[PDB]
Design an enzyme around this catalytic site. Structure first.
Site, PDB file in Angstrom:
ATOM      1  N   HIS A 120       0.864  -1.160   0.000  1.00 31.65           N
ATOM      2  CA  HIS A 120       0.000   0.000   0.000  1.00 31.65           C
ATOM      3  C   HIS A 120       0.915   1.229   0.000  1.00 31.65           C
ATOM      4  O   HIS A 120       1.630   1.478   0.995  1.00 31.65           O
ATOM      5  CB  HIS A 120      -0.936  -0.037   1.234  1.00 31.65           C
ATOM      6  CG  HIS A 120      -1.991   1.038   1.238  1.00 31.65           C
ATOM      7  ND1 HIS A 120      -2.859   1.234   2.296  1.00 31.65           N
ATOM      8  CD2 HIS A 120      -2.278   2.000   0.337  1.00 31.65           C
ATOM      9  CE1 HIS A 120      -3.655   2.252   2.025  1.00 31.65           C
ATOM     10  NE2 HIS A 120      -3.320   2.738   0.840  1.00 31.65           N
TER      11      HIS A 120
ATOM     12  N   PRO B 146      -1.147  12.954  -4.050  1.00 32.91           N
ATOM     13  CA  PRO B 146      -0.829  13.133  -5.475  1.00 32.91           C
ATOM     14  C   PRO B 146       0.308  14.128  -5.761  1.00 32.91           C
ATOM     15  O   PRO B 146       0.798  14.189  -6.891  1.00 32.91           O
ATOM     16  CB  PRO B 146      -2.143  13.652  -6.088  1.00 32.91           C
ATOM     17  CG  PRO B 146      -2.970  14.165  -4.945  1.00 32.91           C
ATOM     18  CD  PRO B 146      -2.523  13.384  -3.717  1.00 32.91           C
TER      19      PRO B 146
ATOM     20  N   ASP C 296      -2.405  -1.588  -3.634  1.00 35.22           N
ATOM     21  CA  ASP C 296      -3.024  -0.298  -3.762  1.00 35.22           C
ATOM     22  C   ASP C 296      -1.823   0.636  -4.020  1.00 35.22           C
ATOM     23  O   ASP C 296      -1.113   1.026  -3.094  1.00 35.22           O
ATOM     24  CB  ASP C 296      -3.804   0.108  -2.499  1.00 35.22           C
ATOM     25  CG  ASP C 296      -4.436   1.477  -2.620  1.00 35.22           C
ATOM     26  OD1 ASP C 296      -4.179   2.165  -3.658  1.00 35.22           O
ATOM     27  OD2 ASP C 296      -5.193   1.869  -1.684  1.00 35.22           O
TER      28      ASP C 296
ATOM     29  N   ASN D 192      -2.036   3.643  -5.358  1.00 33.27           N
ATOM     30  CA  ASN D 192      -2.471   5.043  -5.471  1.00 33.27           C
ATOM     31  C   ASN D 192      -1.955   5.708  -6.736  1.00 33.27           C
ATOM     32  O   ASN D 192      -1.600   6.888  -6.716  1.00 33.27           O
ATOM     33  CB  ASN D 192      -2.038   5.849  -4.257  1.00 33.27           C
ATOM     34  CG  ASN D 192      -2.847   5.550  -3.059  1.00 33.27           C
ATOM     35  OD1 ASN D 192      -2.319   5.135  -2.029  1.00 33.27           O
ATOM     36  ND2 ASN D 192      -4.120   5.785  -3.142  1.00 33.27           N
TER      37      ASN D 192
HETATM   38 MG   LIG Z   1      -7.953   4.581   1.973  1.00 32.07          MG
HETATM   39 MG   LIG Z   2      -6.057   4.276  -1.680  1.00 31.28          MG
END
Ligand SMILES: [Mg+2]
Ligand SMILES: [Mg+2]
EC number: 3.1.13.4
Length: 337
Positions: free
Chosen positions: A180, A185, A218, A220
């Site tokens: 993760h 960003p 994940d 991102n």
């Molecule tokens: Mg989250």
């Molecule tokens: Mg996320």
DNA sequence: AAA
């Protein structure tokens, strides 16, 4: 709530091979399930006593041979996820973020992390590993102020298990890895570096254990990102814009920067329009990657019907009927020795 | 914890 459609990509194979399924799912930990971020979902449906039922039901009914979870709360791992999935035939491995960080007993219970579960009838655990990105950054900063200021200060982790695949399904080994990455960003550079760190550390586990890799994450990161390009193309230019033109020499402690694997996303070519679904942001940021040399994707679980979402006026999750702000990924894979 |  309509059933999500299975998408067949290739049917089963003649040559001897094992197929198995892999789930990747960020459950949204309670700590972060607040009215502030999720004002559009009622309190009673955000609450963990309610949501945990939908989350268990999701994981039970997907019934995957391998499960990768993110945002698993430490105490919930030991008192909910593990003992319930033990009743389903799984064993598991878990590690929390923030292990080196000082905090009360109470706070330690609520810290989240990554978990990999696997059906013990199909697989045997050979090794388990935790990769703490803050620590790998510290060890690899020499020079580079960005490494120490920007990377070492993020508490993210991944976990990896080395599994023996039971011969009867066809010592065949498989590595499963789950991470993760940092969320922000503005920190596209941290995301890419955490990925390079995770992949190179995974390569090292592999050495000490050519061997098939399943990488759930994940990330991102959108499909256009530097991180997805890096994972999908075996590498990226050390001057990719995601570095924020901000690293260089220290970058290749993990090495145009390149990795050895040959990976494909199970859901490539937009088989889902988003994996994270909130009022402010919807996009594909979660992935199941596999080594294309050893494995084919037979199919994937497709997206929830966009028409159903619109008809119910659902513009973000969680929702009374959808227990996380992410949708689970689920893929069936075929492994050739 | 696309605080
Ligand atoms: Mg989250
Ligand atoms: Mg996320």
């Amino acid at each position: 709530l309509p059933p999500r459609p299975w998408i067949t990509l290739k049917e089963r194979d003649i040559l001897p091979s094992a197929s198995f399924t892999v789930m990747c799912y960020n459950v949204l930990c309670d700590k972060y399930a607040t009215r502030q971020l999720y004002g559009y979902c009622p309190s009673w449906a955000l609450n963990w006593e309610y949501r945990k039922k939908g989350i268990m039901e999701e994981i039970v009914n997907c019934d995957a041979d391998i499960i990768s979870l993110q945002e698993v709360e430490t105490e919930q791992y030991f008192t909910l996820f593990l003992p319930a999935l033990k009743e389903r035939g799984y064993d598991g491995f878990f590690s929390p973020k923030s292990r080196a960080k000082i905090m009360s007993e109470q706070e330690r219970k609520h810290v989240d992390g990554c978990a990999i579960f696997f059906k013990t009838e199909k697989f045997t655990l050979v090794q388990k590993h935790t990769v703490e990105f803050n620590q790998v950054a510290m060890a690899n900063s020499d020079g580079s102020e960005a490494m120490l200021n920007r990377v070492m200060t993020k508490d993210n982790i991944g976990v990896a298990v080395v599994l023996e695949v039971h011969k009867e399904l066809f010592k065949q080994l498989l590595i499963v890895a789950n991470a993760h990455m940092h969320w922000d960003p503005e920190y596209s550079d941290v995301k890419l570096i955490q990925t390079m760190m995770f992949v190179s550390e995974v390569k090292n586990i592999l050495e000490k254990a050519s061997i098939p890799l399943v990488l759930c994450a994940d990330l991102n990161s959108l499909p256009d990102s530097g991180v997805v390009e890096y994972l999908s193309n075996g590498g990226v230019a050390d001057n990719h814009k995601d570095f924020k033109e901000l690293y260089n020499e220290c970058l290749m402690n993990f090495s145009r920067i390149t990795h050895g694997f040959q990976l494909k996303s199970a859901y490539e070519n937009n088989l889902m329009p988003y994996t994270n679904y909130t009022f402010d942001f919807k996009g594909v940021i979660d992935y199941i990657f596999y080594s294309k040399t050893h494995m084919n994707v037979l199919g994937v679980l497709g997206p929830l019907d966009p028409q159903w979402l619109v008809e119910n006026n659902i513009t973000g999750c969680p929702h009374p009927h959808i227990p996380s702000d992410h949708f689970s990924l689920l893929t069936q894979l075929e492994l050739h020795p």
